[PDB]
Design a protein around this ligand. Structure first.
Ligand code: CL
Ligand code: CL
Ligand code: NA
Ligand code: NA
Lengths: 759, 759
């Protein structure tokens, strides 16, 4: 029972546990992390090197926002883990190193997903794609894109064109995968390759015995690619002069090793969301040891965390203008899950929790990393306040219900991927599915499947409603039959998509940091919940007159009589939204899926609320054609007028039990609505979230909360004078973005949203 | 209404049938071919253009044989259907055009199968592989070769090294697929693409309904690639100035269109065997019409057939020295199935049947195309004699039992792929499996799984046979267990192989000329049947005593007495060989296979008899270590001494019902053994084959017969003076090869084989 001399030395001082004999990051954390209930008084400030480096990087960020385009990007190199040479901002000042390419902010080419998108980007930003790269990825190496469109049905193609099913991961990396990068810091590459070889070998029997033949062969090949990827991780780090074959011996190496794990991912896959995971607490274990041993000062600790978070502020991907409108603001979703409570009762909050939030002060506000606080009523009051303070000062944080998710998973080591989709680190991933247009599904029910904007048969050919006034019973009967159809097309599209993504763009380096068998879910999204819900409320509580055209196609409606709206704590309308979520979830649930991915749902839109709303005509709720839907599960623009408590209670009523993939809610409130001074504001904000996230056996509670503390006038001033608010950040749909990174139309969406004036 | 304006012009004069409304080449042949029972008196001679062209080509063939290497080959171009520009021998003289590359005999690079073999070839022949090609096919496009070795088990790797399971299609194209190239001549590319699009669409329902999800998605993608390939066929032909979008209007176009279909295959896949199919009779329909209409003279007809067959004499593939010893003589296996009988009773023999055989006279003897006569007792006596005459003059023909295969398939449109593996054209293919070393499996039984040369554990660890004298019942009981193991490793290796080949090197252009659903078989081969059978005969009827070394490993054998050997019509031994075939077939039959390919068996070796024998030590039958086994199902060298009838009867006793993939038998006989003059020889040879292939309800009969009519001295003279026999051809294992194309060791195998002296 003699532990490898490398392991024993690096792990000097660490408490014993199963984690020393097998891969178990959760156990290591449990046996070693030091819970912290104190306040922010220990926090240090930015060093000269940190500011020098960040300011230099801000110069490129300003250029990006100004030109709404990449600073620079590859034109002739196919990116892989080992493709690029080491790149630095300033080699002499960086405590933590690693960039995607050889230059800061220079975007790369990830061709495995598709060559057409690369061409489109090259055309849009005025650059020329190397002819050789093009030839390779059209004639030799088949891409994810081409595989999907070779199998797609003309039905799906129609839904893609009309705006019923658009923006699905058929033209960009699927993402939604979080490799446990902490594994690299803990065990070192070598130990992980030896573990993978074991996993590979454990499948030999089943193979020789014909047990699930094709599934076995596939898994063996995937594990083989995972093994090869881990080796390239070493080669990559080696370019920076590092040897990560063995475990991290100190704090700087734990941070560096963990980042190197992530760096490999963002160098090989261009997923929509490339999240970081739950690492702040984990890294604290190494920082604490170094402080206690007097090998690192508190300021040097911040500097390290700063340089890491700074790299996370520098992750970039070459995207198309089409992608830019579906996912606005140049988002990365390098999500970090901070805090939370353990299963045993103690808080997972640590000094590093504060250090991470402190990056907002040391380097100013920033959209990335997407810092998420795993909220719990049992959290140390000290942390609850500091978190709120940071939200008040920067509007860069988001909150998710730990009291709900922890018990559900019965695990204290789960992380948030992208915006609100939870997963147990290294043991579970998602099959990203974007979102479907539920609003348009209603209009299709009323119009017999013909697109109210394109006048073409998209949905199944059925007779449109002949009525003179809309009847709730009649309309819903069709809405159901159309939702069945929407569910089938949506699942079929995702099945094709993920079959092709596993084939042409298997995320080898991320799956290499996962267990042998990973739990998979078929994440389906719903867009325009409120538009659909309110439209139903205007038919069961008022008089709607369908203004038809020379074919009987309802292109507009007349409204007489005040009708209920989602976001006012009124059960009559709120009960309809909760019903819709349930209906769709029960529908997709009965369909067969690729790799048996358990279908889940999410009320999330991103900037699809703008794109879909743009392609959707006049709706029964009074919304005009071309107008944006509400971001995520939000009530339609301005409709929630009974203050915070009211709008928070409506969104909390939404069943997370039917939307396991998440329920996004962007909440904006004026400084004065929270109090007269900061102390009152912090206390009240924390109190709001305590009431919102309040979990009990008969009360589920809210799942997500974006917090913006600002005034509409400040943003109006930001639109006129961009150069005055360089680091201004806002929560927009489950993630953050610099205000100056949005287009005039995307900003228009923001400013016209609900700004809570009271409580 | 399935009759376009052009279709009617091209099909002018053709009889009506289902074939005009659907893809059915068999029906077209049935309604239009003119059976011919006459003789060879109508045959024309080679034209000046034919001789000029062939002589020029022979200059490169002489270079090949002398240097035992390629004339030239690509080093920087990845071959595809449209990759190369048109290439000619002499543009002004060629009636039928098309070459793999831009120069005659210049070999190409088919990288999709693996880059390592290309590198190996490049160093062997002293050329430099382009660094870009290498980078692409190691880092971007994964190859078949790399996928297999990523999934292979160390057990399989051991079998490969020891010589128990070697030469499997893990380092070269699998082959064993015959696209119906006649479809191009008949319908034209356009009609076939529309038909494929229909096949693609017919799968949409099952897709949307989740019926066999992954299998459906796969098939849709494959059909999509098939469709794309058909379009590239047009582009390819277009380079030669031809438009094959519509059907062949005359004889020259039927030949050209059919070849263009095959050309696409040999430009994109480097399969071990790239057979032509059953085309001679089919093409006759177009030649006949042109003769009757007085458009083409009889000599012009031969010229066309000559130029086609000449192109089939020019097919080449870049191979490694390793491949060269497993498959000796630079073989292509461009097999042509000639003659046969219909289901209705008439003979499929035609004037073109004679024209094809005549290429042996017009352009001298040639190994390729591998011309196979589908023999039947009901064949026109005129054809039976001419066929024998050709065999007597050239030793370039092979015979297979039509009386056996036709009824078995209950189809008169099946073809021979590679050597002896039958398939219904356009409706069935094989999953090539090379062959396993049965002889070594016996030695493993006796030695407890330890390899007699490498002295390492390969088979299952078990106790070696004790005693100073070998006992049949025991030796056979251990072998039976080891065969179970051999069957599992063999099937597992093939499952991995074909999963990877479908993934990284799907033969798109060949499958595009097949039906939507193709029947697949898992072709398993047995090598050293006679060595194994005779060894058992020795152990059973004589006194075989093992001479073990210090560790107890049996490295030699002593025999007291004489025992019956295979090929002497002695049931005491022949029944054993029959037993072995049956045992193995029943074993592999119980195992699960990729794509549910029905496992079949074949007693075929190719040059694996040399390679395996080289890696197999002293055997119980008296065979010395390193000595070659018998080619295919042949009796061991010289062991069959009771004349033709005796050796033919032993091989015929072998159950084709347990070796559906074929039973190869190379038969050599001296000129005088057949008669005093040609008339007697032809009559007798035909008579031999009538007796050999004789089928009945209680007598199965022989399946294959290679016919060599020569004297050993003539070959000995050929070894001393190569330049004197440039076009000398011999049957060696189920195919033909120019004698000068073999290595000194491969020739050594030939000359030491059985040369039947009597009958
Ligand atoms: Cl491995
Ligand atoms: Cl198609
Ligand atoms: Na909830
Ligand atoms: Na037989």
């Amino acid at each position: 029972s003699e532990l490898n001399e490398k392991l024993a030395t690096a792990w000097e001082g660490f408490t014993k546990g199963d984690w020393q004999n097998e891969v178990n990051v959760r156990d290591f954390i449990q046996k070693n992390y030091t819970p912290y209930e104190g306040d922010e008084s220990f926090l240090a400030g930015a060093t000269e090197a940190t500011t020098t480096l960040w300011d230099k990087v801000m110069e490129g960020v300003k250029l990006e926002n100004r030109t709404h385009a990449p600073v620079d990007f590859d034109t002739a190199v196919a990116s892989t883990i080992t493709s690029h040479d080491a790149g630095y901002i300033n080699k002499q000042l960086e405590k933590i190193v690693g960039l995607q390419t050889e230059a800061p902010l220079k975007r790369a080419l990830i061709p495995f997903g598709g060559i057409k998108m690369i061409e489109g980007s090259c055309k849009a930003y005025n650059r020329e794609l190397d002819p050789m790269i093009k030839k390779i990825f059209t004639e030799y190496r088949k891409t994810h894109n081409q595989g999907v469109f070779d199998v797609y049905t003309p039905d799906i193609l129609r839904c893609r064109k009309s705006g019923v099913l658009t923006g699905l991961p058929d033209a960009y990396g699927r993402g939604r995968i979080i490799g446990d990068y902490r594994r690299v810091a803990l065990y070192g590459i070598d130990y992980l390759m030896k573990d993978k070889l074991a996993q590979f070998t454990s499948l030999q029997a089943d193979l020789e015995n014909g047990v699930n033949l094709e599934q076995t062969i596939r898994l063996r090949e995937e594990i083989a690619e995972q093994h090869r990827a881990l080796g390239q991780m070493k080669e990559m780090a080696a370019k920076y002069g590092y040897d990560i074959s063995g475990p991290a011996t100190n704090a700087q190496e734990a941070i560096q090793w963990t980042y190197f794990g992530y760096l490999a991912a963002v160098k090989s896959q261009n997923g929509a969301a490339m999240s970081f995971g739950r690492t702040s607490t984990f890294l604290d274990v190494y920082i604490e040891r170094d402080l206690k041993a007097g090998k690192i000062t508190e300021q040097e600790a911040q500097e390290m965390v700063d340089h890491l978070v700074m790299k996370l502020r520098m992750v970039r991907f070459l995207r198309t203008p089409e992608y830019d409108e579906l996912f606005s603001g140049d988002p990365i979703w390098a999500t970090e899950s901070i805090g939370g409570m353990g299963l045993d009762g103690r808080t997972l909050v640590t000094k590093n929790s504060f250090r991470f939030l402190n990056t907002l002060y040391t380097m100013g506000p920033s959209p990335e990393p997407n810092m998420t606080i795993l909220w719990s009523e049992k959290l140390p009051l000290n942390f609850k306040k500091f978190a709120a303070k940071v939200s008040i000062d920067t509007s860069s944080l988001q909150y998710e219900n730990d009291d709900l998710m922890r018990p559900d998973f019965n695990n204290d080591d789960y992380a948030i991927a992208c915006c609100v989709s939870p997963m147990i680190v290294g043991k579970q991933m998602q099959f990203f599915g974007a979102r479907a247009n539920l609003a348009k599904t209603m209009l299709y029910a009323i119009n017999g499947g013909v697109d109210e904007k394109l006048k073409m048969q998209v949905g199944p050919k059925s007779e449109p409603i002949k009525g003179d006034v809309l009847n709730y019973d009649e309309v819903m009967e069709r809405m159901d039959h159309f939702m069945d159809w929407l569910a089938k097309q949506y699942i079929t599209a995702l099945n094709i998509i993920h079959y092709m993504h596993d084939k042409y763009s298997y995320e080898a380096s991320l799956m290499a940091l996962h267990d042998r068998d990973v739990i998979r879910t078929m994440a389906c999204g719903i867009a325009g919940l409120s538009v659909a819900a309110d439209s139903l409320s205007a038919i069961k509580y008022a008089k709607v007159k369908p203004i038809r055209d020379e074919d009987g196609l309802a292109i507009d409606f007349e409204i007489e009589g005040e009708y209920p709206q989602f976001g006012n704590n009124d059960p009559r309308v709120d009960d309809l939204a909760v019903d819709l979520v349930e209906r769709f979830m029960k529908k997709i649930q009965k369909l067969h899926t690729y790799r048996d991915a358990i279908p889940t749902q999410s009320v999330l839109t991103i900037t699809s609320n703008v794109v879909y709303g743009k392609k959707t005509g006049n709706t029964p709720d009074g919304r005009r054609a071309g107008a944006p839907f509400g971001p995520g599960a939000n009530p339609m623009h301005g409709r929630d007028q009974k203050g915070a408590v009211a709008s928070l209670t409506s969104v909390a009523k939404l069943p997370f039990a039917y939307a396991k993939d998440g329920i996004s809610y962007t909440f904006s409130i004026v400084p004065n609505a929270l109090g007269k001074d900061d102390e009152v504001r912090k206390t009240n904000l924390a109190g709001l979230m305590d009431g919102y996230f309040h979990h009990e056996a008969s009360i589920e509670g809210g799942q997500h909360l974006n917090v913006n503390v600002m005034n509409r006038e400040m943003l109006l001033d930001a639109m006129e004078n961009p150069e005055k608010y360089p680091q201004l950040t806002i929560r927009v749909s489950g993630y953050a973005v610099r205000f100056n990174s949005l287009t005039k139309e995307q900003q228009q969406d923001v400013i016209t949203r609900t700004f809570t004036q009271s409580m």
